[PDB]
Scaffold this active site. Structure first.
Site, PDB file in Angstrom:
ATOM      1  CG  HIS A  25      34.429  42.171  43.187  1.00 12.85           C
ATOM      2  ND1 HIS A  25      33.730  41.518  42.192  1.00 12.85           N
ATOM      3  CD2 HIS A  25      34.719  41.234  44.121  1.00 12.85           C
ATOM      4  CE1 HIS A  25      33.598  40.244  42.514  1.00 12.85           C
ATOM      5  NE2 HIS A  25      34.187  40.046  43.677  1.00 12.85           N
ATOM      6  CG  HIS A  73      37.233  34.570  37.990  1.00 14.57           C
ATOM      7  ND1 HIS A  73      36.402  33.473  38.074  1.00 14.57           N
ATOM      8  CD2 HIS A  73      36.506  35.626  38.424  1.00 14.57           C
ATOM      9  CE1 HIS A  73      35.225  33.851  38.542  1.00 14.57           C
ATOM     10  NE2 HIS A  73      35.262  35.150  38.763  1.00 14.57           N
TER      11      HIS A  73
HETATM   12  O1  LIG Z   1      33.811  34.856  45.109  1.00 12.99           O
HETATM   13  C1  LIG Z   1      34.011  35.668  46.268  1.00 12.99           C
HETATM   14  C2  LIG Z   1      33.765  37.090  45.969  1.00 12.99           C
HETATM   15  O2  LIG Z   1      34.497  37.509  44.811  1.00 12.99           O
HETATM   16  C3  LIG Z   1      34.087  37.996  47.191  1.00 12.99           C
HETATM   17  O3  LIG Z   1      33.959  39.387  46.854  1.00 12.99           O
HETATM   18  C4  LIG Z   1      35.497  37.732  47.680  1.00 12.99           C
HETATM   19  O4  LIG Z   1      35.820  38.591  48.771  1.00 12.99           O
HETATM   20  C5  LIG Z   1      35.570  36.289  48.114  1.00 12.99           C
HETATM   21  O5  LIG Z   1      36.865  36.043  48.652  1.00 12.99           O
HETATM   22  C6  LIG Z   1      35.317  35.383  46.895  1.00 12.99           C
HETATM   23  O6  LIG Z   1      35.411  33.996  47.264  1.00 12.99           O
END
Ligand SMILES: O[C@H]1[C@H](O)[C@@H](O)[C@H](O)[C@@H](O)[C@H]1O
Length: 274
Positions: A25, A73
């Site tokens: 992620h 980010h």
């Molecule tokens: O902050 C969030 C988060 O990182 C989720 O895992 C992602 O799928 C979303 O799109 C994001 O807005």
């Protein structure tokens, strides 16, 4: 088998949806600018670099960019460009030609359609490394390993809400399309609840074989950092997967993590049959 080439040992006829795949992620959040070090515990989600993650067995990546073609980010620059990412991924596939990489590509400023057009020239440079189908083909079917060998399965996410169509070819598919089930409860859930949703999604993933399961182990909150959630959840997820492997239950989908440990990634891989 080596984590560097684990998919090559899998049978050519296996469907992508029938595998247990380790993924990361916010893949690129392991380095960044000055704002990144100032907000490090809240923004950082990985310690291993992109090339190191791929060599460790990760086959699903989460790349987030802006129309300037740099990795971000949110407002935080991650000291990386999409070209640099594409070159790294492409080099890995050239070295290990049987592996396949699922790649979620998100636009950090989902308010503009200029993202779709701006990334096209870059994606086009690497057309030979992307799984592609004709524009007219709306079959949406999940490919077989033979079809994605040494290629990138792109999952586009942007304002257009459609798949990246360059020329007459459709690059990958749309993130959130009807053929993929997503568990993305990131917004401050309790550890117990988050675990239930991870387990439930893995359970549903085992019974189906016609859809891609994106199961996020990751999360954040105002009082719990990504690092804290991972330290609590990853091990719990790992033991659950180890158990299911004993019961001969395979094909758990994509387990998307923060700070995955090398051993954890290996056990998720071992859930598949060789
Ligand atoms: O902050 C969030 C988060 O990182 C989720 O895992 C992602 O799928 C979303 O799109 C994001 O807005």
């Amino acid at each position: 088998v080596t984590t560097k080439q684990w998919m090559s040992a899998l049978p050519d006829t296996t469907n992508l949806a029938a595998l247990s795949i380790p993924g990361t992620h916010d893949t690129m959040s392991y380095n960044g600018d000055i704002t990144w070090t100032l907000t490090k515990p809240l923004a950082q989600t990985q310690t291993m670099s992109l090339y190191q993650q791929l060599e460790a067995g990760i086959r699903y990546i989460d790349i987030r960019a802006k129309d300037n073609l740099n990795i971000y980010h949110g407002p935080i620059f991650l000291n990386a460009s999409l070209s640099g990412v594409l070159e790294t991924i492409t080099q890995f596939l050239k070295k290990n030609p049987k592996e396949t990489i699922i790649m979620r590509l998100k636009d950090e400023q989902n308010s503009n359609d200029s993202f779709d057009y701006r990334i096209q020239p870059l994606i086009n440079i690497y057309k030979d490394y992307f799984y592609t189908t004709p524009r007219t083909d709306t079959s949406n079917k999940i490919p077989t390993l033979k079809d994605v060998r040494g290629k990138i399965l792109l999952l586009s996410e942007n304002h257009t809400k459609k798949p990246l169509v360059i020329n007459s070819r459709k690059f990958g598919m749309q993130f959130g399309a009807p053929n993929q089930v997503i568990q993305d409860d990131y917004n401050g859930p309790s550890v117990k609840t988050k675990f239930k949703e991870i387990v439930q999604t893995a359970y549903q993933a085992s019974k189906a074989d016609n859809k891609l399961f994106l199961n996020h182990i990751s999360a954040t909150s105002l009082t719990f950092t990504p690092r804290q959630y991972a330290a609590a959840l990853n091990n719990k997820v790992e033991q659950f997967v180890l158990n299911l492997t004993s019961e001969k239950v395979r094909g758990l989908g994509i387990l998307i993590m923060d700070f995955p440990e090398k051993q954890t990634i290996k056990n998720i891989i071992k859930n598949n049959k060789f």
